Amino acid sequence: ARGPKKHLKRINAPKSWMLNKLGGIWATRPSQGPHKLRESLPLSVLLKERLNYALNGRDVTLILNDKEQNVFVDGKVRRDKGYPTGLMDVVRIEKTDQSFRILYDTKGRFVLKSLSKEEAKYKLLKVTAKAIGPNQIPYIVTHDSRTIRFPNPEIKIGDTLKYDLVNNKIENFAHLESGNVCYIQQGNNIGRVGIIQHIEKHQGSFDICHVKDAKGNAFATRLGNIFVLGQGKKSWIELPSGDGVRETILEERKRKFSY
Amino acid sequence: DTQIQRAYQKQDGVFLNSKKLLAKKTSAGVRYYKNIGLGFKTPKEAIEGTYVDKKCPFTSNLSIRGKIIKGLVISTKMNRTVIIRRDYLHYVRKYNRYEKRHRNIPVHISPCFSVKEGDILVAGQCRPISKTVRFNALQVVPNEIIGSVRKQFLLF
Amino acid sequence: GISRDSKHKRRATGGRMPVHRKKRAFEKGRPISMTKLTTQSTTITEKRRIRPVRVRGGHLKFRALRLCEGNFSWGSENITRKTKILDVKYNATNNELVRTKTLVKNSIVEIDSTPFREWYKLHYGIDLGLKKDRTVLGNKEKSRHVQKRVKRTKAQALEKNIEEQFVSQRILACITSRPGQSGRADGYILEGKELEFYIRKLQSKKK
Amino acid sequence: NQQYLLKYEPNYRLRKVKILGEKPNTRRSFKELKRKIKRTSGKAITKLLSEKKGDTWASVQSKKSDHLKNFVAK
Amino acid sequence: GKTYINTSKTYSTPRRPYEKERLDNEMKLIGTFGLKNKREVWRVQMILAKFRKAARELLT
RNA sequence: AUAGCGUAUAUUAAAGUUGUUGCAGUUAAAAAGCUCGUAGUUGAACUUCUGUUCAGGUUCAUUUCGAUUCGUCGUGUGAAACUGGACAUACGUUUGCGUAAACAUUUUACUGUGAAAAAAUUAGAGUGUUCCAGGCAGGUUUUAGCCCGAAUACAUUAGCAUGGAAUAAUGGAAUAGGACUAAGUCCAUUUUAUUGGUUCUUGGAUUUGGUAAU
RNA sequence: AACCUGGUUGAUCCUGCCAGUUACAUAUGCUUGUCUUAAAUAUUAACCCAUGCAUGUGCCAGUUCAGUAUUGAACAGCGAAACUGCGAAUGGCUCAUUAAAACAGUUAUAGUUUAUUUGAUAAUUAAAGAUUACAUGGAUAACCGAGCUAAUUGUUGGGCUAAUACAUGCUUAAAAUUCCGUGUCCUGCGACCGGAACGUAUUUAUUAGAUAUUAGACCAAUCGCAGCAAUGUGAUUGAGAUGAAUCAAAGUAACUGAUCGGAUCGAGGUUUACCUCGAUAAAUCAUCUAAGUUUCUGCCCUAUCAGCUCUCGAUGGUAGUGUAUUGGACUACCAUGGCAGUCACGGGUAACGGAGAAUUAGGGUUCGAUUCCGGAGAAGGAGCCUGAGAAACGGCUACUACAACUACGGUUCGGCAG
Ligand SMILES: [Mg+2]
Ligand SMILES: [Mg+2]
Ligand SMILES: [Mg+2]
Ligand SMILES: [Mg+2]
Ligand SMILES: [Mg+2]
Ligand SMILES: [Mg+2]
Ligand SMILES: [Mg+2]
Ligand SMILES: [Mg+2]
Ligand SMILES: [Mg+2]
Ligand SMILES: [Mg+2]
Ligand SMILES: [Mg+2]
Ligand SMILES: [Mg+2]
Ligand SMILES: [Mg+2]
Ligand SMILES: [Mg+2]
Ligand SMILES: [Mg+2]
Ligand SMILES: [Mg+2]
Ligand SMILES: [Mg+2]
Ligand SMILES: [Mg+2]
Ligand SMILES: [Mg+2]
Ligand SMILES: [Mg+2]
Ligand SMILES: [Mg+2]
């Protein structure tokens, strides 16, 4: 197809952005970055659609080219309109001192979770690879594309580190075993939150894990979509308010409209 | 010990000439084997054979990745290669019944197996070895077929 | 304009297989480098000739047109030296390759003993080029540096083939590089089994 | 402050508010200029650029600043 | 021109173009509800029909 | 019929005039002159039946009742088909804390779940675009705000995961060392920081006694 | 809305079609007043095209002695030209080709490539030569000047000066490890002493890649370590990843020098010899992005297609070669295979495949050139340049068939399926 694709059409932009069908032809193609294209929430959508701080395209440009440095991701400045803010990222707006975390709700759209200052220092990281590096230095790699050196050696692959973004120092970690708390990054089970019942390894391809929530409904999903939220029943994150429990539309209609 | 070909045949990643081994006038003595970790037992013969097969999953660099097959061996006619046969019932929605279809997969046989025509083969997916062959033989199950191998239809 | 596409062949059944797209530049193959020994060629001024090749991804690949010297290893001894390659003796692929003196992987070549002869002499105090008066050891006994030269020599016994060859000063070695890619003839010296074999092959060709 | 307002609102709006001016006919000119420019070299090219019909970004920020200098706080 | 606005059909036309009983009922409707133009009654028919398909599927 | 309405042509229902559901074939068009027969399609009956006890719901009935109310709830009592315990020669061992594994259960078709799944479509919730087509918005003077939405279903085949007893195919001990067990013989063999002998384990083969309703 | 009616007879019950009825696409005829939307040279001719336009781009952060402005006496605001970057491979158009092909859903890449992004690394600037590091060297465009043509985004000579352009090169770890010395002591090729080599990468060869999801004892030698010393003393954490590696990360040889190891830029300043923010170039590994190949299964009509494939590849095996990589992709040798009534092979399609569309009691029937995703092509074939990506076509070369100028000798930024 003669090389790389530089455009994205509105119809094809992920449902998670909640763009208007009728709003145009194109949408903003997420930039190459920490997160994949489909797991991206770009900045331009973050500002224009979600916060409404930008009313149109020009506006976004204004915010991100203003010498004043308005927007922050994991502590580091970003001027790129299509920067792929992904899952677990902490995005902070210097002028208002708003600190949000990027998440999926149970319905699988992108949400900004308002965080107080103590939350906003911390960010959750999930182990992708673990290796010996050059010079015989152990290293570890993360979903947000971090490379962390000299990890605590007990840290296994597919764990969750709690990362201090002020100190760039991993604080506490927990791994994928029975009894820990998860959030589910991708699935039809996207956004649900729960205690791991157990894990079955099929060893040819795809390992499936099962989950429960506070209410006691089971889930299953492939290992890749599990993200660990801490030890115990306690999560190290403030969840958008479903608390991670899915609601039957019956439950929804009942509680909302009193049926 | 058998060398018949234009080129001398030895496994890769195994050095035959080490100072201890030159003291023995006998071919080889240190052999390469492997584990292909799908829970597949590495055969007795892979271990004790003299065979050079660069396409053997046990004796070589062959990586078995992602797809596994059960089948019938219809033809062991060619050099270190068989054909396998998978029979299935394709469902025709309208007439609301099935239809008997078959597929022939060329598989690669490592010399470590004894393969009678009309046996039962397990094969793992493989990198493209030849024009036809994407599959390599893992496990042979012996069995007796009466009459020609073709007519015999097993859906398992 | 050479092509590696599989589309230009018959599918398994024998059926003529259809074509919509063109030749694509990414299925490109490239002309062959017949890589030559300039060593014995008298008419040649330029003995070493290597071509950079701009490749997919902006990298380089290195074409050996003309080669004379290469880098060879002696396996038992773990000793690797660069020497001049003399002749291409046997080729399993095709014999017109031997006639054209072409270098390819698993070609069979001969090597100047000389660097290996010297390393051996240095290390074990034994000159392999000589028939009689084989031992070069120093005059002071009980001197750690001569003692070592004996202690080395104590365990060692060579193949008659390696010895005889060393005397001859030419050595049979099969070459392990891809000169049409790397731009090198790098190789290993034949020992034991492979030597029995390629000697016999050379021998029944010679018979 | 009307500083910000003067720095943020786009130009067609500053015309609605009478601050800026008319956007004159761009396209035709610009494309005939493109024509001639492509078809010669540097000296002549500069001589053509002197004649471009554009309302320059310079002139824009100039009228903006000047209007910011003619302003009186309520 | 690409456009993503949706298609509509508000009414339907009878298998049988002329049948007295039906025509008469339709003119009794046009009369009492002060309509013009038979399709008005047809689109009402359409609407009702939608409702009924719904109830039916739900009774499955 | 109506701001629309004729006509031509392809195609859809009409068509049970293409028929799996679902057609016809003595005489309306239609059984091949007749047998043998390979592919194909199709295939008789039998195997943990059954009974007894416990619990959980889910239904039912109503000369049991109740409470309140514009019909649900609680409760009876019995009666069902379950679902799951339990003992009965009876859907398994063995181990670590109702759930895993390993062992053992011949394979599959079939069926129930689940994962993986592209939006727009379609079905459909919410919402008065003046209705509506439709859009994904909206609603509120508590206003340097507030409230709420952008659901859900469907997503056929084949791959994947897992629960399955019927039905259907296929299997297993008929030249049996088949099964269990004991005692030998070989070939390998992880651990015991290392090579050697003995061993040990283990995991294959093999010889012979014993056990069994063979 | 799960409905049927007209026509064979003198009449009758049948079969059966014709006809009516219905929806929906194009077409068309007549007729047309508001408002809200709105398809649109697919079908025939992937036929041919005048003209205009559809691909350009500058920050404070690579080059300014243009110009402007009476500017920090090296420039400093604004801002051409022209080098140097980057893009031009997306987008838009069309459906001619195409029937396991493309496509769809499912896989593999342990068989690969990826410019721009995000994260992390980096002590050695090979040898010979050269060597200033308070920083190396030679050129050229714009410009000035002279020309050639009837002709174009043609270019020829001549005089100038920059670059992040084109060349070149300086930058003091320790330890350990390997080798060498006719060195000391010795007897362990062991210790001390002395001398080399020693980044990364490239190319081969060899040594080990550690395994605590796991079991031990009898002889010998145990190698070590407390310890000269007989005596022992055991041995138990120290090294990741996978289902699997010949993986990661390492040791020892050499090999290449065609890898990289900053002679570049801003800004704000503590009054200025020092701080604090940044821009950019580039290597490796991840990461994003996309691609190449790839597993399994699934297409319409046709037997007035029953056998097909294999003289140079048909199926497999070997060495090679080639490629980004896998492979008969290609070569040499070898074997005689591979597919087919479960329809091979071969025709046809007024056939691009899907997402979907019209009808629909149920089951079906019939369409999908056309918004989205794949695929293909740019008049027809082939071949290339350059790139991270191209067989590009709003790039070049050639032919076949054509388009535009011509002073006839030449020329075209000639290619509407934008
Ligand atoms: Mg961008
Ligand atoms: Mg995998
Ligand atoms: Mg590169
Ligand atoms: Mg403007
Ligand atoms: Mg008759
Ligand atoms: Mg039966
Ligand atoms: Mg029991
Ligand atoms: Mg008659
Ligand atoms: Mg009559
Ligand atoms: Mg009709
Ligand atoms: Mg009006
Ligand atoms: Mg410029
Ligand atoms: Mg065909
Ligand atoms: Mg296929
Ligand atoms: Mg000059
Ligand atoms: Mg020293
Ligand atoms: Mg300064
Ligand atoms: Mg079609
Ligand atoms: Mg398209
Ligand atoms: Mg694809
Ligand atoms: Mg046009």
Tokens standing for residue C183: 């731009």
In this structure, are residues A90 and A114 in contact, taking their beta carbons and an 8 Å threshold? no
Which A residues, 15 through 34, put their C-beta within 8 Å of a C-beta on chain E?
Answer: 21-22, 25
Helix (H, G, I), strand (E, B) or coil at C122: helix
- Identify all chain E residues contacting A21, using CB atoms and an 8 Å cutoff: 4
Among E3, E4, E5, most A C-beta atoms within 10 A, so best to mutate, is E4
CA of A205 to the centre of ligand 2 (A): 6
In this structure, are residues B1 and B27 in contact, taking their beta carbons and an 8 Å threshold? yes
Can you list the positions of beta strands (E) in C3-106?
Answer: 36-37, 49-54, 60-67, 69-74, 79-91
Report how far residue C115's alpha carbon sits from residue C80's, in angstroms, rounded to the nearest whole number.
Answer: 9
- Identity of the residue in C6, C12, C76 whose CB atom sits nearest the CB atom of B19: C76
- A250 CB neighbour count, 10 Å cutoff: 9
Helix E39-59 with E20-32: angle, nearest 10 deg? 100
Least Cα distance to A217 among A259, A184, A185 occurs for A184
- Identify all chain B residues contacting C157, using CB atoms and an 8 Å cutoff: 23
DSSP state of E6: P
Report how far residue C85's alpha carbon sits from residue C70's, in angstroms, rounded to the nearest whole number.
Answer: 7
Residue C88: Cβ-neighbour burial (10 angstroms; 0-12, 13-18, 19+):
buried
**C8 — alpha (psi -120 to 50), left (phi > 0) or beta?**
alpha
- Identity of the residue in B3, B22, B23 whose CB atom sits nearest the CB atom of C191: B22
- Cβ partners under 8 Å of residue A75, min gap 6: A90, A92, A165, A166
Least Cα distance to C149 among C122, C113, C119, C116 occurs for C122
- Identify all chain A residues contacting E4, using CB atoms and an 8 Å cutoff: 11, 21-22
Resolution of the coordinates in A?
Answer: 3.7
Report how far residue B78's alpha carbon sits from residue B83's, in angstroms, rounded to the nearest whole number.
Answer: 9
Q: Considering only alpha carbons, which residue of chain A is nearest residue E2? A: A25
CA of A205 to the centre of ligand 20 (A): 21
DSSP state of C95: T
Strand-strand pairing, C36-37 and B135-141: unpaired
Report how far residue A26's alpha carbon sits from residue A14's, in angstroms, rounded to the nearest whole number.
Answer: 12
Measured CA to C1', what is the nucleotide nearest E14?
A: G22
CA of B32 to the centre of ligand 2 (A): 24
- Cβ partners under 8 Å of residue C37, min gap 6: C67, C68, C85, C87, C88, C101, C103
Tokens standing for residue C16: 């003529």
- A142 CB neighbour count, 10 Å cutoff: 20
Question: In what helix (H) or strand (E) does residue B78 lie, and over which residues does it extend?
Answer: strand B68-78
Tokens standing for residue D59: 């002139």
Measured CA to C1', what is the nucleotide nearest B124?
A: G295
At C201, the amino acid letter reads: K
Interchain CB contact of B28 with C (< 8 Å): yes
> Mapped to the 3 state alphabet, what secondary structure does A82-151 carry?
CCEECCCCEEEECCCCEEEEEEECCCCCEEEEECCCCHHHEEEEEEEEEEECHHHCEEEEECCCCEEECC
| CB pairs < 8 Å spanning B and C | 38
Helix (H, G, I), strand (E, B) or coil at A63: helix
